[PDB]
Amino acid sequence: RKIALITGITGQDGSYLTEFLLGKGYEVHGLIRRSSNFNTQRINHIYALMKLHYADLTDASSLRRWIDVIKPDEVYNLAAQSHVAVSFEIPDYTADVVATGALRLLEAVRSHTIDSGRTVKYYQAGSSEMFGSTPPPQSETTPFHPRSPYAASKCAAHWYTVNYREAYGLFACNGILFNHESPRRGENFVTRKITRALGRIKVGLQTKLFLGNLQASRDWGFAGDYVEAMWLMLQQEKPDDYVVATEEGHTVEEFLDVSFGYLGLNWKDYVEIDQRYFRPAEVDNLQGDASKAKEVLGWKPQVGFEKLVKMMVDEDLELAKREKVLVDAGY
Amino acid sequence: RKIALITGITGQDGSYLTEFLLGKGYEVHGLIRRSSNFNTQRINHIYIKALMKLHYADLTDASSLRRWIDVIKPDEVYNLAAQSHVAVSFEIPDYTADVVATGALRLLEAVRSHTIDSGRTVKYYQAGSSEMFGSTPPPQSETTPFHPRSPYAASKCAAHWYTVNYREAYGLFACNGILFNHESPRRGENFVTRKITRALGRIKVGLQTKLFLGNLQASRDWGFAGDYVEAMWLMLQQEKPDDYVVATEEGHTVEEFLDVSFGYLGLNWKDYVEIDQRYFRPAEVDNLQGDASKAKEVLGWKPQVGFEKLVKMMVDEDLELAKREKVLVDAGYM
Amino acid sequence: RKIALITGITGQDGSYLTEFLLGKGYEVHGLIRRSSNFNTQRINHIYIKALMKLHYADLTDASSLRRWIDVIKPDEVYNLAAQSHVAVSFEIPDYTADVVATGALRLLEAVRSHTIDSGRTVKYYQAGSSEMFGSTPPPQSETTPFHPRSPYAASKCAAHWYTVNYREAYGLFACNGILFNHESPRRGENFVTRKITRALGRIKVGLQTKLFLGNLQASRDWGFAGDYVEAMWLMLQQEKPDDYVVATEEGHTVEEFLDVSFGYLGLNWKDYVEIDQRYFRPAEVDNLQGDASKAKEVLGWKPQVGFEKLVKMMVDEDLELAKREKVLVDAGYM
Amino acid sequence: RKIALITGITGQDGSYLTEFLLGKGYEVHGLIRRSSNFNTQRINHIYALMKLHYADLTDASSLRRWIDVIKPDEVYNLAAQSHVAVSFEIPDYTADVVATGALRLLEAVRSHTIDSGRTVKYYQAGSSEMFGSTPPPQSETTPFHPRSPYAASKCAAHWYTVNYREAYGLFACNGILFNHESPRRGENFVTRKITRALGRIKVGLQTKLFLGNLQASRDWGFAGDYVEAMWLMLQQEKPDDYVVATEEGHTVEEFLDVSFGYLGLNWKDYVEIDQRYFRPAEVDNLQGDASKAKEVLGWKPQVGFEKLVKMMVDEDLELAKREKVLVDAGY
Numbered sequence A, D: 001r002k003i004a005l006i007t008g009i010t011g012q013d014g015s016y017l018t019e020f021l022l023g024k025g026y027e028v029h030g031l032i033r034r035s036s037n038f039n040t041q042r043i044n045h046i047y048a049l050m051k052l053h054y055a056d057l058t059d060a061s062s063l064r065r066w067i068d069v070i071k072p073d074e075v076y077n078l079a080a081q082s083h084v085a086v087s088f089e090i091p092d093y094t095a096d097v098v099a100t101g102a103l104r105l106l107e108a109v110r111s112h113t114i115d116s117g118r119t120v121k122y123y124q125a126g127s128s129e130m131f132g133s134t135p136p137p138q139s140e141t142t143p144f145h146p147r148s149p150y151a152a153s154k155c156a157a158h159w160y161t162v163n164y165r166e167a168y169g170l171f172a173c174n175g176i177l178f179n180h181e182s183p184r185r186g187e188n189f190v191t192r193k194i195t196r197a198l199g200r201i202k203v204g205l206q207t208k209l210f211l212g213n214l215q216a217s218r219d220w221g222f223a224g225d226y227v228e229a230m231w232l233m234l235q236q237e238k239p240d241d242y243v244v245a246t247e248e249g250h251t252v253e254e255f256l257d258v259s260f261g262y263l264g265l266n267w268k269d270y271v272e273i274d275q276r277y278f279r280p281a282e283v284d285n286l287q288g289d290a291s292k293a294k295e296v297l298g299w300k301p302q303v304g305f306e307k308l309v310k311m312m313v314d315e316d317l318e319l320a321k322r323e324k325v326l327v328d329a330g331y
Numbered sequence B, C: 001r002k003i004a005l006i007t008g009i010t011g012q013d014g015s016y017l018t019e020f021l022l023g024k025g026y027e028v029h030g031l032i033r034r035s036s037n038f039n040t041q042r043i044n045h046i047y048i049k050a051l052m053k054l055h056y057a058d059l060t061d062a063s064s065l066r067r068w069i070d071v072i073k074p075d076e077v078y079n080l081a082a083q084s085h086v087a088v089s090f091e092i093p094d095y096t097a098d099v100v101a102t103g104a105l106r107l108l109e110a111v112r113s114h115t116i117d118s119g120r121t122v123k124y125y126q127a128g129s130s131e132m133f134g135s136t137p138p139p140q141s142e143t144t145p146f147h148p149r150s151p152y153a154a155s156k157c158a159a160h161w162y163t164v165n166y167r168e169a170y171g172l173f174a175c176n177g178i179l180f181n182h183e184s185p186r187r188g189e190n191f192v193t194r195k196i197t198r199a200l201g202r203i204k205v206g207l208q209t210k211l212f213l214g215n216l217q218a219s220r221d222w223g224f225a226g227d228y229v230e231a232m233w234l235m236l237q238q239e240k241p242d243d244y245v246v247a248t249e250e251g252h253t254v255e256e257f258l259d260v261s262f263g264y265l266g267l268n269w270k271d272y273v274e275i276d277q278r279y280f281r282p283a284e285v286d287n288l289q290g291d292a293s294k295a296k297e298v299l300g301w302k303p304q305v306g307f308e309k310l311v312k313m314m315v316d317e318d319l320e321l322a323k324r325e326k327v328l329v330d331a332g333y334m
């Protein structure tokens, strides 16, 4: 049975990748951070085929320890302080996890393979955020012009990963994934923030939705579809980097149009602009060119924009309906 | 309106201290870690205008600490942040040390730097632990020698000494609270007391049938977190800074905890408990029982919640949680 | 009297920049690492009243950086600190990244925090490198894409982007100097140019007989460090911050360096050089040649020391050192 | 041939330990920091039996990498930002190296032994500074009351080391060494600062010597003698902690009396007190009780106080004589 080690297993992507790999017959191990509260909300339903271990990307010893014990065949580095706005607040921590943390994992894997003689395939969770202000459409070779500490740190991780492949022959691939959402997306990201609020507004638990820049345009796909691409990259004869995206861009305003309209509401009756949600340096327009992924990996997105928006609205409306009962039942 | 900055505000103690200080009229700020999931479960009820504010930071990021101290200009700083689990510390020793030992020094240095650059005065509290005593026999008082038995314990010893040093070398009003074990309905579920009451509730309603534990003979001095945070505040209100043991002065074994808890619900723990060697620690701490005479005399502090009341408080709460879970499971929502 | 804070003051560039700024009437402060041995060899002659001050700090210690920025209140900050050797970076990638990439961000954030808290204005220089271009073919200008070929190079790319981001997001007057290779008689002996001239001097006097090297076909744009530090200062005197390539625009191979150096002393390098595969890098950078048109047009900067003059300057100095060593060795003092 | 790995090999102790172990037939490896300048001054004369490798105690990956490659039989952790005064200036860095760095090495060794099944003996460079203000004589069990960030960090390293021995059965020993000097002692420490200045004053290159607290009392031994004790601890049947000291205390003023008097000078004609050399929190009196080391290890110091002072004065006078020639010859 193939063994996969996933860092960031508790996150959106880790939860879907875990289900995907288990379905493929893998033995899946994940590294999780010790937390004072429950932090396995996304994978509790899955939880001898899935094992969790305490570690941290800022602790190199912890990474090597588990790689040695697990002896994984594939390593997926999904761990990250993944929020752009938050990265402006904690740039140093973000860099240590997103940039240096990736290098620590790469070095631990490289050290493991040398000492044990084993072979390990590696995936780095790259991001379209790396392109920053470089105009669309963005492909694998489009120049990076990062606009946040998070983005710059991902650029660093990208190059550390390319370097380990070129210098050591490590089978390391960089997935340059554009924004991907789902009903498990963090509530601090704009899409989930909108659908969560919409659900609550629909049932009467909320009356206002505060947002920032509605004109930012993004290429939004479904996380469930994207994790398949990660796996596909590691199944090729040679390692390489690939853009994974829907190739269709939409503004936050369009997301609002589709979501609220879907439930028969006019978002303008509820949305208010709060300048505190603006970023110090904005990324105006991301739209990927995923031609390479289609040609080489045979990968294509299955969930389209409106389908994704509506999937998220349906799920968050159900959550809001449950909350309405509780708030009402005296809970 | 006094301003307090609490690191570790999302934890058990941070949640109770926040409520306590807000009740005293403070403006409370807390440092929280960015998380992929919600991590404010213990304080959301509080958060829900401008008296409690949360900010992103990390004890392994000195820049983040100084940034908020400069912006907030706190009058009191309570360092409660820590990878606080002993068993886990053996698994991630390096990370634990960076947060529990060096992280404390980073905060001390950020506070010292802030006071020097701004000319302001700040009072400081370090969350010390009876775990520092380790294998040193009880009763343990402020002058009892430390013999740490885990990376966590050794790191707390380090934080203790860094704190004492900043007080002695720079005159910083820094106090070390040497608190013995304190629990509550908000205690992490991985600690033995909460693990037991959570399991008990589920066993009582039929959602669980076996409870796996390790060393049942370990003895601890267990108090209520709500009572203990009051002592933290009291230390910072004294004329001079000092270190104080905060404890109930009564010890009980894990086995006694089982007796009281299961017996409270008419069950025999021996019917459900099984011993799993995986829960034993590489180096155990056999018996902790504090001598809190100093705290009683100087601070006028005394615990209000006794052992039995604490156990029952936790059992009642976790039984209610278990009943709610039973409804959800039977209905197909869990 | 303007105040400059230089990180990496003990290095090649720091030593020349210090002399340059002192000549401009600056009060210069430098951050140095504590070392078990003396580490001020390049600047001791300068240090020897109150115009050059040294302070202990480390780019991996954010607290130390902010502490000195607060005390010093610099007008200009030059981040020259780095584990600057490419070959070494493959051996200690993690440490290199923490200093070269994150360390730069720590300094940027400390400066940003200082300016926000104090209301002061600070100009900032980041020591970028042509190594960032990696395998991207020459000539390389400010807009040439980066394709780093070492952990060091990737880390410098990171520092470059963190710096650009602080300029764009916060309006910090931060400039990236994209300097191509620059040498001098103070160049580290582990870099190829100094390794060659040091060995040549010893070979000329009979203290050494073989010179082991790696890839002789690698081509570099080599300028004089003394000329380049002037460009750093010039960037910070402009109306607005920007990034600039600083180079001679002429490339030469390691083999040409050998031809010029050994030939200058009437020797045939082929009689002494041997190739040792251990000196080859896991991923090589084949050809760097800068396009410094922007620097020439905007800064009015132009290199004064050409390739041959630079090689001879280094050979002359290292021959003198070798002669001194010969005396000591023959006399039993070495 | 036994293999030893020494961290801090470029320091005073590492240089003497290297010579001692090589004399015992060991293959010695040392970890050194990359430096912009020469940093092997103390071991250049020694430099296939001595190998140096780049690493850093703040980089766990580097430590494990070399332990795996070298497969040492004995590990001596001598690496540290070892100056007390300096520790008040850079407390965070000092702690990361002296406290956490020791734990990183312990964990790397432990991880190595588990993954490889090998056995490794370990030595931690403890210090009498850990006792701080606790009154003398100080023995192995004397309570610690550290008076500096450096001291507190050593206390931490001490306990991390004791814990690895107690929890994992690691053969780890803590050498609680009292102050030890030599002609290789760092010039920023009081003894070497005095003898270096004395030599220069004697030849006319210096006229004043600025010092701080002359009433501090220390137990001063010879570094060459002390490294033997380190080795001896690792040769015992069981691991333990041992105080290594001369059991005789002297004030800085007495050191001045002996040193300057030795060359026929009156130190009062040259010494001036500069308050900047006072420490925020002073350690007044250290005097060790090395009974255990004598009884168990059979260790006893060979170089006494005055012998040590005079050894240092002789060496630094020669150095000053060489400098006088150079400064004179126009160099």
Ligand SMILES: NC(=O)C1=CN([C@@H]2O[C@H](COP(=O)(O)OP(=O)(O)OC[C@H]3O[C@@H](n4cnc5c(N)ncnc54)[C@H](OP(=O)(O)O)[C@@H]3O)[C@@H](O)[C@H]2O)C=CC1
Residues within 6 Å of the ligand: A007, A008, A009, A010, A011, A012, A013, A014, A031, A032, A033, A035, A039, A055, A056, A057, A058, A077, A078, A079, A080, A081, A082, A083, A097, A125, A126, A127, A128, A176, A177, A178, A179, A180, A181, A186, B034, B035, B036, B037
């Ligand atoms: N989703 C997107 O649209 C895009 C995301 N990415 C990247 O892909 C990856 C997955 O994204 P996504 O699932 O949405 O992200 P999430 O924020 O949902 O999950 C992040 C994961 O990283 C973990 N983590 C954070 N810090 C550390 C640390 N110091 N040590 C160990 N683990 C840590 C988190 O743990 P915890 O639960 O404890 O916080 C969580 O498991 C990330 O690297 C992200 O940056 C790339 C392109 C676009």
Ligand SMILES: NC(=O)C1=CN([C@@H]2O[C@H](COP(=O)(O)OP(=O)(O)OC[C@H]3O[C@@H](n4cnc5c(N)ncnc54)[C@H](OP(=O)(O)O)[C@@H]3O)[C@@H](O)[C@H]2O)C=CC1
Residues within 6 Å of the ligand: A034, A035, A036, A037, B007, B008, B009, B010, B011, B012, B013, B014, B031, B032, B033, B035, B039, B057, B058, B059, B060, B079, B080, B081, B082, B083, B084, B085, B099, B127, B128, B129, B130, B178, B179, B180, B181, B182, B183, B188
């Ligand atoms: N409770 C006891 O019986 C005793 C506890 N102590 C100590 O007192 C303090 C409070 O304990 P308690 O509330 O039960 O502990 P918890 O484990 O419940 O809470 C720990 C807190 O620290 C935070 N934290 C952890 N790591 C970091 C980090 N790197 N940066 C910032 N914050 C971080 C946690 O955040 P997150 O929610 O993100 O994990 C949480 O807010 C701790 O220091 C503990 O060690 C002392 C004596 C006895």
Ligand SMILES: NC(=O)C1=CN([C@@H]2O[C@H](COP(=O)(O)OP(=O)(O)OC[C@H]3O[C@@H](n4cnc5c(N)ncnc54)[C@H](OP(=O)(O)O)[C@@H]3O)[C@@H](O)[C@H]2O)C=CC1
Residues within 6 Å of the ligand: C007, C008, C009, C010, C011, C012, C013, C014, C031, C032, C033, C035, C039, C057, C058, C059, C060, C079, C080, C081, C082, C083, C084, C085, C099, C127, C128, C129, C130, C178, C179, C180, C181, C182, C183, C188, D034, D035, D036, D037
């Ligand atoms: N020289 C060149 O050809 C090129 C160099 N560069 C870059 O320009 C800068 C200057 O180069 P150059 O003078 O030759 O480099 P050097 O290697 O000579 O000097 C590096 C300096 O950084 C210090 N330093 C290293 N690590 C740390 C740390 N953790 N904390 C604090 N200080 C530290 C060194 O101190 P110590 O003396 O203690 O080691 C030294 O002062 C560097 O950033 C280099 O990467 C850019 C383009 C080309």
Ligand SMILES: NC(=O)C1=CN([C@@H]2O[C@H](COP(=O)(O)OP(=O)(O)OC[C@H]3O[C@@H](n4cnc5c(N)ncnc54)[C@H](OP(=O)(O)O)[C@@H]3O)[C@@H](O)[C@H]2O)C=CC1
Residues within 6 Å of the ligand: C034, C035, C036, C037, D007, D008, D009, D010, D011, D012, D013, D014, D031, D032, D033, D035, D039, D055, D056, D057, D058, D077, D078, D079, D080, D081, D082, D083, D097, D125, D126, D127, D128, D176, D177, D178, D179, D180, D181, D186
């Ligand atoms: N000497 C004494 O009187 C006493 C000393 N001690 C301790 O014993 C040990 C040896 O002392 P001594 O030789 O005088 O000390 P030194 O200061 O002479 O040497 C310290 C050594 O540690 C190295 N080092 C420092 N920081 C790091 C780092 N981050 N990573 C790797 N190596 C590093 C130094 O390298 P570099 O050369 O690059 O600076 C040097 O090799 C130290 O741990 C010291 O604290 C204990 C009791 C008393």
Ligand SMILES: Nc1nc2c(ncn2[C@@H]2O[C@H](COP(=O)(O)OP(=O)(O)O)[C@@H](O)[C@H]2O)c(=O)[nH]1
Residues within 6 Å of the ligand: A084, A085, A129, A179, A188, A189, A190, A191, A193, A210, A211, A212, A213, A214, A216, A217, A218, A252, A277, A278, A279, A282, A283
């Ligand atoms: N998170 C967030 N983003 C917002 C908000 N209002 C507008 N946006 C914008 O929506 C875009 C997407 O943000 P986010 O979902 O956080 O993902 P990103 O693409 O990784 O930044 C960015 O341009 C944000 O500035 C808001 O309230 N929250």
Ligand SMILES: Nc1nc2c(ncn2[C@@H]2O[C@H](COP(=O)(O)OP(=O)(O)O)[C@@H](O)[C@H]2O)c(=O)[nH]1
Residues within 6 Å of the ligand: B085, B086, B087, B131, B181, B190, B191, B192, B193, B195, B212, B213, B214, B215, B216, B218, B219, B220, B254, B279, B280, B281, B284, B285
């Ligand atoms: N956490 C935990 N502790 C257990 C268990 N079984 C016995 N104990 C013991 O209970 C005591 C208290 O453990 P814990 O609540 O984690 O708090 P500590 O005092 O901070 O270690 C220790 O002696 C543990 O070894 C178990 O399953 N979990």
Ligand SMILES: Nc1nc2c(ncn2[C@@H]2O[C@H](COP(=O)(O)OP(=O)(O)O)[C@@H](O)[C@H]2O)c(=O)[nH]1
Residues within 6 Å of the ligand: C085, C086, C087, C131, C181, C190, C191, C192, C193, C195, C212, C213, C214, C215, C216, C218, C219, C220, C254, C279, C280, C281, C284, C285
């Ligand atoms: N340092 C070094 N470089 C060498 C050697 N032999 C050839 N070179 C090459 O010379 C070029 C310049 O190396 P270096 O001076 O270290 O500077 P870099 O340009 O910062 O790598 C690179 O292509 C090296 O591979 C050698 O023995 N040492």
Ligand SMILES: Nc1nc2c(ncn2[C@@H]2O[C@H](COP(=O)(O)OP(=O)(O)O)[C@@H](O)[C@H]2O)c(=O)[nH]1
Residues within 6 Å of the ligand: D084, D085, D129, D179, D188, D189, D190, D191, D193, D210, D211, D212, D213, D214, D216, D217, D218, D252, D277, D278, D279, D282, D283
């Ligand atoms: N380093 C140093 N110590 C001094 C000086 N003047 C007095 N001392 C004292 O001498 C004692 C020994 O200092 P040091 O040699 O640095 O070693 P320590 O015992 O590790 O602090 C301490 O009490 C210092 O305060 C001075 O100029 N430098």
